[PDB]
Scaffold this active site. Structure first.
Site, mmCIF file in Angstrom:
data_model
loop_
_atom_site.group_PDB
_atom_site.id
_atom_site.type_symbol
_atom_site.label_atom_id
_atom_site.label_comp_id
_atom_site.label_asym_id
_atom_site.label_seq_id
_atom_site.Cartn_x
_atom_site.Cartn_y
_atom_site.Cartn_z
ATOM 1 N N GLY A 1 0.778 -1.234 0.000
ATOM 2 C CA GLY A 1 0.000 0.000 0.000
ATOM 3 C C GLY A 1 0.814 1.290 0.000
ATOM 4 N N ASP B 1 18.336 -6.371 5.275
ATOM 5 C CA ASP B 1 18.113 -5.440 4.148
ATOM 6 C C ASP B 1 18.499 -4.005 4.478
ATOM 7 O OD1 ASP B 1 17.442 -5.027 1.432
ATOM 8 O OD2 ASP B 1 15.289 -4.943 1.850
#
Length: 342
Positions: free
Chosen positions: A25, A137
């Site tokens: 989103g 990450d």
């Protein structure tokens, strides 16, 4: 019944929405009416694809369990009162104006800034590691910044519980984390289940802070390795003997010999203590690479270092890494129950 640009209905508590979007989103800022402060809201819509479910669950489990000034928290999580009606989930966080990726596109950092940001990256990382979690990450877009230079690490979607016992794998085993910040061992013989994978990414970030460009911008999986080796030079025999994996060792031995490019050639304007710490983060052999606590204790950071003000987690973390889509939805529902008056 309240839109922005899609639906973005975040109860009575949050108003005056404004787009900042396309992250997970979409993202908006909003006025919080119980604390009268502006805040960020991210809308997550992950119950379709079963992998975005896993990332969402993982991220929620970590975000809620972690509590640290240099790690983004979830102040609130909004969803429907029932599993049946739960389609979206909204995570409400401290509003952070920018991130390091956006900052570095436009801004040169003074040495004082580099030092402070690095200190805060490593302070957050020490907490994470103390919980037995690997972020996996770390990159400039996962480092959020506010107007007063507070830095917070975000995006635990690829995070795992450390498992050094089970870190070995074959040559050229595919990997998911962002290529430019991948340690050399991911291409050779590692699944990225040890702490040293995050320290490499941190080193890449330092290098990027010093010159405003990625130090190792490989175009694809093995080019990444040739970037690394083009700067570090060919690995020593003894580093090669730590690679038992024959396919990986023989690959490296097939390569022409490359000498080290000294850091001060690459970064002639850099504080030489910064380059020494960089060297120790971007060490080829993961066994010799500096650990998070040694990095915090390095001379470059001596203005900040204070281990009594560098908190650790209260206990080790317990197993992400796994479940059908419907069970995942239920776990997400159960994990977010504490924000429901319900």
């Amino acid at each position: 019944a309240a839109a922005a640009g899609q639906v973005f209905d975040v109860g009575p508590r949050y108003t005056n929405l404004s787009y900042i979007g396309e992250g997970a989103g979409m993202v908006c800022s909003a006025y919080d009416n119980l604390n009268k402060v502006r805040v960020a809201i991210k809308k997550i819509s992950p119950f379709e694809h079963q992998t975005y479910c896993q990332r969402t669950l993982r991220e929620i489990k970590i975000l809620l369990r972690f509590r640290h000034e240099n790690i983004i928290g979830a102040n609130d999580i909004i969803r429907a009162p029932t599993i049946e009606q739960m389609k979206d989930v909204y995570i409400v966080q401290d509003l952070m104006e920018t991130d390091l990726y956006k900052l570095l596109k436009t801004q040169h950092l003074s040495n004082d800034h580099i030092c402070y940001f690095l200190y805060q990256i490593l302070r957050g990382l020490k907490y994470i590691h103390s919980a037995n979690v690997l972020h996996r990450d770390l990159k400039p877009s996962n480092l959020l910044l506010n107007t007063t230079c507070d830095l917070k690490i975000c995006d635990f979607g690829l995070a795992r519980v450390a498992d050094p016992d089970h870190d070995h794998t074959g040559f050229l085993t595919e990997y998911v984390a962002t290529r430019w910040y991948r340690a050399p061992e991911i291409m050779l013989n590692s699944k990225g289940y040890t702490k040293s994978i995050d320290i490499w990414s941190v080193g890449c970030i330092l290098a990027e802070m010093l010159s405003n460009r990625p130090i190792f911008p490989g175009k694809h999986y093995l080019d990444q390795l040739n970037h690394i080796l083009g700067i570090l030079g060919s690995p020593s025999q003894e580093d090669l003997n730590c690679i038992i994996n024959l396919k990986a060792r023989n690959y490296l031995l097939s390569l022409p010999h490359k000498n080290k490019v000294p850091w001060n050639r690459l970064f002639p304007n850099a504080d030489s203590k910064a380059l020494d710490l960089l060297d120790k983060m971007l060490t080829f052999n993961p066994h010799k690479r500096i650990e998070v606590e040694q990095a915090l204790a390095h001379p470059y950071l001596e203005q900040y270092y204070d281990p009594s003000d560098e908190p650790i987690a209260e206990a080790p973390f317990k197993f992400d890494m796994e479940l059908p889509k419907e069970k995942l939805k239920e776990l997400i529902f159960e994990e977010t129950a504490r924000f429901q008056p319900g």
